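Obj: model holo form, ligand = iron/sulfur cluster.
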Amino acid sequence: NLIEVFVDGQSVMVEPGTTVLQACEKVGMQIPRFCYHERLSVAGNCRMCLVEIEKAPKVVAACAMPVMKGWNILTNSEKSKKAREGVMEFLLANHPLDCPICDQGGECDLQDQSMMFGSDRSRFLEGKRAVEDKNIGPLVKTIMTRCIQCTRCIRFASEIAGVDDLGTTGRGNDMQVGTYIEKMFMSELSGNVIDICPVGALTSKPYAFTARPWETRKTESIDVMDAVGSNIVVSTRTGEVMRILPRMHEDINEEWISDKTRFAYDGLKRQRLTEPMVRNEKGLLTYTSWEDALSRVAGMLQNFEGNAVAAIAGGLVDAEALVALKDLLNKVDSDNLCTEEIFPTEGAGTDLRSNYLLNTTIAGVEEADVVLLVGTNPRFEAPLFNARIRKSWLHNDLKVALIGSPVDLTYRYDHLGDSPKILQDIASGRHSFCEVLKDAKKPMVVLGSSALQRDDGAAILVAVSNMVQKIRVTTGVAAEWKVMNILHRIASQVAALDLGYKPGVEAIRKNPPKMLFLLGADGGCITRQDLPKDCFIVYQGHHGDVGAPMADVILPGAAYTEKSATYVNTEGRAQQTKVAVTPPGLAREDWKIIRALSEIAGITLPYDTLDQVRNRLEEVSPNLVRYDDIEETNYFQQASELAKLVNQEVLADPLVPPQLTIKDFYMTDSISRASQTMAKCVKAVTE
Amino acid sequence: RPTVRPRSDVTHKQLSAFGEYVAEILPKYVQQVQVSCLDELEICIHPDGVIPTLTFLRDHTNAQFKSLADLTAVDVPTRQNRFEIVYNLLSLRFNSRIRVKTYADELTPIDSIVSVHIAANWYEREVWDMFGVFFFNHPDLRRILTDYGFEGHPFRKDFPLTGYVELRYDDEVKRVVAEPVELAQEFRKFDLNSPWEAFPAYRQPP
Amino acid sequence: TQLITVDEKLDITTLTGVPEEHIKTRKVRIFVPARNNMQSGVNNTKKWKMEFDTRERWENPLMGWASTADPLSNMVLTFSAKEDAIAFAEKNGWSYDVEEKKVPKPKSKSYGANFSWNKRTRVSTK
Amino acid sequence: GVQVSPSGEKITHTGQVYDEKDYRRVRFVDRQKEVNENFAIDLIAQQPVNEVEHRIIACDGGGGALGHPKVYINLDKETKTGTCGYCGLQFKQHH
Amino acid sequence: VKPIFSRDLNEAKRRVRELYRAWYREVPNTVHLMQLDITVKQGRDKVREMFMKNAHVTDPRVVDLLVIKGKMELQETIKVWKQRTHVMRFFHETETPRPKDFLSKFYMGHDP
Amino acid sequence: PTTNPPTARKFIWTNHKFNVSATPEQYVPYSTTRKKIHEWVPPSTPYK
Amino acid sequence: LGLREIRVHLCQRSPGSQGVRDFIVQRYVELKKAHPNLPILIRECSEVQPKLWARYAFGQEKTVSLNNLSADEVTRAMQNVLSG
Ligand code: SF4
Ligand code: SF4
Ligand code: FES
Ligand SMILES: [Zn+2]
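Output (holo C-alpha cells):
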C-alpha cells in the first residue's frame, strides 16, 4: 500500500489517504498554508496552497487532493508561483493596514508569506472593507477588520474546542467571522484560537501590546497547575515574562494549551513573595535577611526533632524540592511528608506505579474503544486530556461513559448514575453497560483526583479496582494495555507519590506536629485548628494567598518559569522546566533554600550543584531524570490482589468535583487566585 | 529585466575550464572545485595543500595570481574542522580571482604562506589572534589586534559577543584594571529567521 | 611532521579564554527549537541550536534596563547535526542537556472523511 | 492634567511615580523631573467626534503621506465611537 | 591526528620546562624595569599558580598550543609590549574571588 | 517667519527653553514604567 | 535498628533483573500484608541496575545491588534487610 509520488523528480513512497502537503512534507518542501492547520480538519478556503500537478491545465489545491499514481507536483513552477502571487494579491486586496498596530508583528503568518511568496506592489486603489469588532471575551481581543475569513477558528470551535459559536455570517466580502449575537465565547481552550489564527485578527488581550516576538527570547519548559504536563515556550523580553505559548509534542499536547496556564503568566508578577519575612515581637511579618531567617528556622529545627517536625507540600512544587526536603527531614528522621490533595494510603499509595498514573498513554487514548470516567470533570481538571478525548471521540468511533455529577462536556457522554454503588453494580454485573463493554475490545477507566478527596476514597479505589478486574475478565486484552489509570489536578502530587511522600493529611491529623512547615501549600484543608498554638510554620514558596498570611517565617521560592526544575505529568513522564526569568530580589530556588537551611542547621545535606540534585534524584527514583519518556511499568495484578483484601464501604452520595461549572475553573492553586486576568475571567463569566 | 543583474556565461565557462585545469594539475592536492554563481571560482584543498597550491597559483604562467587579497577563517561549529581558512588570490594579468578554501580546527594547523606570499605576514597574525588557528614557519606569530593579555580568540562562534573582560579605571591601584564583564543594558538578541522556505533551490535534504 | 595517535577525548577548554565560572557552573542545551505556534513554518525547526542556561537579568537602577552579568546569555549557536553539537559541547567542556527532535507524526487528513454517513467527524461549518 | 504626589513628584502620564521610601528620587534633588504639560491621554477628549455619512470611513491623520497609513474604520455600531487605532479621532455615523 | 611541534608528552613537558626557565629568568628584569609594584617572589608564585591552573590536562596538542600562547606572553613581556597594568591584570586585585562554599554563594546572588 | 510663518499648534511651546546643562533646570533620566513585580503585603492583624 | 522505607529499583527488559521481577510478580503481596505501615516503593527504569535502597533512620540509606540475582537470593536480601 504505497504510492510512487514525484515532487520535482523525487521518489517518495507515501501511503494512500494522504494530501499533497503530507506528500511534500516528507520531501521538505512546504507548500504555503493559511486555512490548513495540521491538526484541524481539511477545508480549502484560503487557496494559497495551489500547485500544478504535471501538465493538467488546472492547478489543484494541496489540501484536498490525494496524490493518485505517479504525479509530479511542480512546487516551484511558473503557474504555481503565479497562483501564489495572485492569491496573495487577492488576500491583500481588502486587508486593512494595521501592521504597526498588530500584535502579530513577527508572528504574522501572512507577513512572512507575502514577504517570501507574494508579489511586490499591490495594484489595489479602491477601498477596503471594514468589519465591526466583537466582544468574544477578556482573553481573545477580536479586531475582525483584518480577518481573511480563512475559517481556521470555526473548525477548532466546532471540532476540538466543541463550543459551536464562531461561524461565518454572510457572503462575499460581507461575510464576517464570529459570534452573530453578543455571545461571550469563553470556554476552556479558548486561548488556542489565537495561535491557530495565522492573522493577528483575534489575539490575546493581556498580551495586547506589551512586547514583540522578534524582541522576545523563547525558552522551553513544562507546565504546572494542570497535571497534563504540556510543553510550553515561555517568550521573555528583558527578564520579564511576556508570552506563554504551546509547544508541539504529540503525546502530551498537540499544539494546544489551556486558558488557565496560558493566561496565568500575569499571576507571576502580582502578589509575589520576594523577601524573607519573620514573625516580629508585636505579631506582624517584617522583612529580614536570609542570614537571620534561616538561622531562626535552624534554631527552631534543632530543638524539635524525631517525629513532630512535619511538612505539607502540594501544588507548584518541583520534584527536586521534594528530594531535598525529604533528605532534610529524613536526617531528622520524621516521615510526616504530606500533600495538599488526598490520595488513599490504605492500599499501595506510594508503592506500585500503576495505581496513580495514566497507565494508558495519552496518545493511547486514541487507541481505545470504551472510555469510562468516574469522578472528575475532565473539561475543567486537566482540559487537554479532554481535548485528546474529543479527538479520540471524533476520529474513531469511541464510546464514552461518565459516572457522577452530570456536567456538560464537549460531547455527548452517556451519563450513568450519580453514585459510587454503581461501580459495585458493574463489578457484580447487572447493568446494560457490562454488555456494552462485552461488545467492545479496548476499554479504559479513569478515576480523577477529586473523587479521591472524598471520605470513601479508598473504598472508591477498591471498588474501581475490582470493577476493572471484572472488566479484564470480560474483555480479552493484552498485558501491554493496562486499563486502570488515574488523572490528577495538581502537578506535584504524582511527583510526591513517585518520591514516596505519604499523600493526604492523614499523618498530620493523626499526630499533630510541634513544628509543621509548609512548602508551597495553599489549599483550604490545613490551618491552625488541627495544630498547636505556636507551631512555627514556614511558607517555603510563592504567591501568598492562604499559607503566607497564616505563617510564621516566610521563605520566598521560585516559580515554574523561574528554575531548572523537574515536573511529572499524570503519564509518569517527567520533564524539565528551564529557567526563563530569575525570581525577583531575595527569592531563590526551592532546593537552594532547603540546602542552605541544611547548611545553617547542624545537618549536612550532600548537595552543591543542581546536577548533584539530579544524581540524588537518580538514587531516589530513576524516572525523574529520564526526560520525555513515559517509562513502561506494570504490576497492577499484585495491586489488585493487594487491594482485594482491603474491606471498605462506599456511602450513597453523588460524587462531584469542586469544579462543577466554569465559574470556579478559573481560580486554582494561588496563581489564578492572585492574578487580575483570571479575576476578569470570573467577573466576565459570573455576570 | 532591469531588476536582475545580467548574467554572462562566458566567464562561467572559462572559470569552469580553469577549475577543471587546476583539479587536473593537482589530483592529490585539490578536494573540491566550485565555480559558483556570481562567477567566482572556489578551490577547496587539503590543510597540507596550501603551500604548493599557492606556489602554483603565484608562479604558474597561466595562473599568475601574484597578489593575495586576504587570509580569512570563517567559523562553522557544525563541522569536524570548524575553520574554513580562505585565501583570495588576484591575477594581475588574467584579471580573475581564486577563492581557495581549506579546512582546519584549532588542533591541526596549516603551514603558512609567508615563504611564498609576504602579503600574509600580518594576515597570519590577524587570523591566529582572531580564530586560534596556529601557523607553522612564521617569523614572529603574535596576537596583534586584541589586547596584551586578552585571553580568548574573539571571532570564534563559541566566544560571546560581549566578551569576558571589561576595563575600568580604579583609584585603588592608580591604574586601569580588568574586571569580569557586566552590562548596563543587555545585548537584545533577536530571532529574525523567518519560518518559511526562502529559497527553494538552496534546501537541505532531511 | 609525522602522524601520531592518542586515545584521549579532545578538549580546548583552556584556550577559548573562558573564565572558570563560565565553564563549570553552566549548562548548555542541544535542542531543536520549536516552531512559533502562530506561525506555521519549518525553517526554525530544521536546524539544531545550542542555547545556554539563562542566568539573572536585573533591572538597571537608572531606567529599568536589562542589566546582566552573564555574557553567554545572548548566545545561540546554530548547528546541523546532534552528533556534531554534542561533540562541540564535549570539545568546549560545558555540560549538555540534549533534547531530541520532536518530529510531527503525519495525520490521516482526508477531505472525504469530513462528510460521513455514520461517523461523528462531520463538520457543521461548511 | 499633571498630578502631584504627596512627595511633590509630578506623575508621568503613563502612570509612573516614585514611592516615598525610594532611593531613586535622589537624582531629583537640586534638579527637576521632566513632565510635559500636554498629556496625550487628555489631548483626545478635546477632539470632537466627526459626523460622517459613510458606512466605512478612510483615515490618514491629515496630509496624506504626512500622517498614518490610510486605514478604514467601520461605523455600523452607532452606540460606539468608531475610532482610528493609529490616531484616536472619533468617527460617528450621521444617522 | 597531525600534531603541532611537540610530538609526545615528554617533549611537550621539556618545552614547558624551557618556557618556565625563560619566565623565571624573565620576572626580575620585568619587576625592576617596569617600575612594578609586586614582589618578585609574588610574581614567580603567580607564574607557578598560572601554570598549576592549566596543569590538569593530558593532550600534547593543547600543551604545545599553551606553549605557543606562553611564548607570545613571553615575547610580549621581554620586549616591553605588555605594560604595568597589562601585567597586573593577571593578579585581579580589584575583585575578591567568588565564594567556594555554598552559603555565601546562596547569599550573594543567583549563582549556581 | 516674518515673511512666511510656520504652522502654530495648540500644544507647542510659547517660549524656548535654552540648553540647560549644569543648571537647577536639568533633564535627569528615569524609568517611564510602573512596578512590574507587585509585592505581597503582610496582613495588619496577627494569626491569633 | 528498624527500617523505614524499602526502595526497589527495577529494570523491565534487562535479563539480570528477572529474579526480582519474578519476586515482585509472585510474593510482593504477602510482604505488604506482613508490613503495611512501612512503604516498600517499587520504581522501574529502563537499562538501570536493580537496587534495594533501604532507608532506616537519621538518613541511613543502605544500598544492595542485585544484578543477576535470582528469587531466593532477592528474598534472602529482603530478609536480611528486614532483620537489620
Ligand atoms: S495580521 Fe494583518 S495587520 Fe497583522 S501584521 Fe499580519 S498583515 Fe499586518
Ligand atoms: S479569525 Fe483568524 S482563524 Fe478565524 S477565519 Fe479569521 S483569519 Fe482565520
Ligand atoms: S492551504 Fe490549501 S486552501 Fe488553504
Ligand atoms: Zn486616523
